[PDB]
Amino acid sequence: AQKLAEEVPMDVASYLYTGDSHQLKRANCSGRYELAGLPGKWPALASAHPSLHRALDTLTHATNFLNVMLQSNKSREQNLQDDLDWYQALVWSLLEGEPSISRAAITFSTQVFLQATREESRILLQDLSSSAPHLANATLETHFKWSPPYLECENGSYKPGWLVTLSSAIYEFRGVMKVDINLQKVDIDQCSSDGWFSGTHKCHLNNSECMPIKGLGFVLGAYECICKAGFYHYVCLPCREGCPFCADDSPCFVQEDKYLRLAIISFQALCMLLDFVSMLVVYHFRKAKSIRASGLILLETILFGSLLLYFPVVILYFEPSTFRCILLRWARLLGFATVYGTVTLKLHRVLKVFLRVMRMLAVILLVVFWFLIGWTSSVCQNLEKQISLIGQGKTSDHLIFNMCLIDRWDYMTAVAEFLFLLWGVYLCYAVRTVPSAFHEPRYMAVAVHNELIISAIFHTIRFVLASRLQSDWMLMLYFAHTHLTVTVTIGLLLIPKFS
Amino acid sequence: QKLAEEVPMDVASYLYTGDSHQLKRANCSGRYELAGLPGKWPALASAHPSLHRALDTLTHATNFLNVMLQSNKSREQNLQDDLDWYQALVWSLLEGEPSISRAAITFSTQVFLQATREESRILLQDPHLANATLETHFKWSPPYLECENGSYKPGWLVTLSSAIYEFRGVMKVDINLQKVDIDQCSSDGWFSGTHKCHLNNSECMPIKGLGFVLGAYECICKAGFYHPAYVCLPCREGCPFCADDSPCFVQEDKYLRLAIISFQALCMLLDFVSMLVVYHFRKAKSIRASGLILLETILFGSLLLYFPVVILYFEPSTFRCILLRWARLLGFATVYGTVTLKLHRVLKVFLRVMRMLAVILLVVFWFLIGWTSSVCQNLEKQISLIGQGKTSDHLIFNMCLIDRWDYMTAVAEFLFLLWGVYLCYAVRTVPSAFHEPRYMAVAVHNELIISAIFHTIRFVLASRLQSDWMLMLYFAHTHLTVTVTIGLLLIPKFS
């Protein structure tokens, strides 16, 4: 909030405050004290580096000692002979204790003053008021008195150190003691809650975090903004998708040949439309030798089942959800039933006549619905929200991909399909020479064996290696599998009834 | 360790250093002062800032005297007017901090001055430390109790000592270390040991109040409870919060459980000898209606159907619940299937069944295999277990759990018996040699009603059923249903 004000009230110091480099500041011509009154905070009585605290502690003891000596009975005011020696020793003592105090001075008038500075390694002293002198300010107040940040000027040359005046009254006021703490080698944290001008004006919220350096100098721009799960290119930005550790801002999710996806879905919808078209057609041709050999209801049922079996191809095109996988199972399972049950049930009707199918079908769908209702409940109730989840993102050893998962339930269902087809294989093997005007049983058995073999292969391939199948190979596998099986099973039962 | 050595070198102070009650100490007459020589450490720690403040005020006053007396033109007409300066010097040495009791400086440049915060007015007036200073920077001391024409004075003092320049001076502050809390269970603090609290099963937990006093800690025993000196106890079998050290694994009568198992095994043996008898009477006029293979099939199903009453008598495990499911399901099938199918044969003749039975057995084995696999493969090790713990009022009990699979199973049994019901209602006017359909239908209706009631009561409130009530319920259900179903088909074939 003051970053703009700080960038419009400095010329030589401006660079020095942001870089620590004395080489510009030493060439800048000075005219008076170059301190800052407003850019800083309220005060440094709480949040301050240890040095400052010690600096104040020194003055405190030196102020209490003088106060008690000035408030003692029969105050002599014999400042001529040896009082000046006491005060000079009291000032050299004031300096000698803290390792971060650069000048110190004492002055009073009731007309002399002494000061000292840490010159090279020893204390230089002089008989002249030198350093801090808030006497004019203390008199105007007439306790403690701090000051702002300020650069000292020596022989018309901006000093290369940031000083602070501390001032305290001597007791009515009649003295001003002042230490000039050298605040040049102090730490400052713009990311701290309550401290020296806590302004972290470089990284606010978006993938932001301030982890600053410990030992740098009384200088700013020393706080490495951290990219909280994002890209690091002294700037933080967002990442392509749900893929953290963006060592590059490149993508993690595999690509999709959409050109190959739209053809897939379009051909599937074409086949579904043609199936519905076939159902209407058979509803038109109800007086031919269709009805006599194979009832209309059974054929419309087969076609509705096949329509109910194309669903997986379109379910897999969309993004994997947890409502989808379930519908994938319902469709597959229920259509298999309503299609091959009546297929083999029709064969059963034949073998029985050689020596009433809907009642003997609804048993199948009842068992099916019972199993489905159970599976769905066990998933939705316990293993969808509590611990387990179907939708799983697996890695291809360098890239990820989502998919529906499999479970033992699928293994046993495939086995059921196998055995249910086994009954039809033996049934078809039995009726190998039964009188027929249209030879339907021949085509039925072909469909049955096709489904059995093709389904075994597909299920094996699906359950072996589902950890390394991206979302464009499974689509092709489900498409080539369903097209072969179902389209053959439809043609073999429909085609011959028009010729 | 030095806890035993600290409890063998005290008389009155020992109790005054653990309670902090001046009322005993003030009655104990003492010649001179005494201090705890053994302070299990030295005076160079950062436990309280007070000591830091009183070292700061001492080092700041010692830095002045050492830089004044040793400065240039130090002529030192020491008796004329310097005394005024030194008096202001010592008076201000204790008029800066809040906890410093006496302060004094001695010099030969003998001369000495002192000042003490008496009540609220700091009076200003005109040994070991000075002697050790002559013998020998900063020089601290240990914890020590003062006393003079008093008793052992009721205050813990510390001597701070320094020198000037050689050794021509001795300034001392007596920091009042009486209002300084101590952590007996700190990693680094004064008296940092363990009076009588073993961490094997417990944790200290210090407080923030009182004053310097040993035994200022309330120990906490984890995985157990304390005596209601405070020390720890190993808790009861598998019960982590023992408000009492009483047991949680609820009382279970044995002279009921034994009778139950006895009666069940008696019925099994009676069922087995019911099988052998049938195998003796392979020749009769009764079996022509109800074949031999059908009855032995019913009796073997019944025999295994009894299993649930004996499984629950044992401690429940993961292998147990699974066999409970298998047995119940498998036996229901192999009995009521052939029952219902005999009625079907009757109705069809009115206008073998082993081949029309293995279908059901196949469907059952298929579901069982799947259920067992999904259980043992996923939800037995990952996050999920069969062992479930419920509570009756405020007390626990172990048992097997249920899952939606059981509800759907019950529905299947219902529907299978509704087929039997219709099949029984269709055949209500046939002639017969033994009126078997009459008793069969009686068994079916009974099975349906009792089966519905039991499964409902079983699912509704299984979280509040201690492990002696479920056994009684299984006893009642299985005895009623199965024993009726056996009698109604067997009994009439001997009369």
Residue numbers in the entry:
A (entry chain A): 71 to 180, 189 to 220, 262 to 290, 299 to 360, 390 to 511, 525 to 668
B (entry chain B): 72 to 180, 189 to 205, 211 to 220, 262 to 290, 299 to 361, 389 to 511, 525 to 668
Give verbatim excerpts from the published study on this entry:
We determined the overall structure of apo GPR158 at an average resolution of 3.5 Å. GPR158 consists of an α/β-fold extracellular domain, a cysteine-rich (CR) domain with an epidermal growth factor (EGF)-like fold, and 7TM domain. GPR158 forms an elongated shape (79 × 147 × 49 Å3) and dimerizes through both extracellular and TM domains. The extracellular domain dimerizes through the side-by-side packing of α4 and α5′ and α5 and α4′ helices (′ indicates the second protomer) in a parallel manner, with a buried surface area of 1806 Å2. The most notable feature of a TM domain is extensive ionic networks present in three layers. Layer III contains an ionic lock, a hallmark of the inactive state in other GPCRs, by tethering TM3, TM6, and ICL3. Overall, the extensive ionic and polar networks in the three layers stabilize TM3, TM5, TM6, TM7, ICL1, and ICL3 in apo GPR158. As a result, the space inside the GPR158 TM domain is not sufficient for the ligand binding. In apo GPR158, the TM4/5 helices are arranged in an inverted V-shape at the dimeric interface. The GPR158 TM domain exhibits both inactive and active features of class C GPCRs; hence, we cannot elucidate whether apo GPR158 is in an inactive, partially active or fully active state that can directly couple to the Gαβγ heterotrimer.
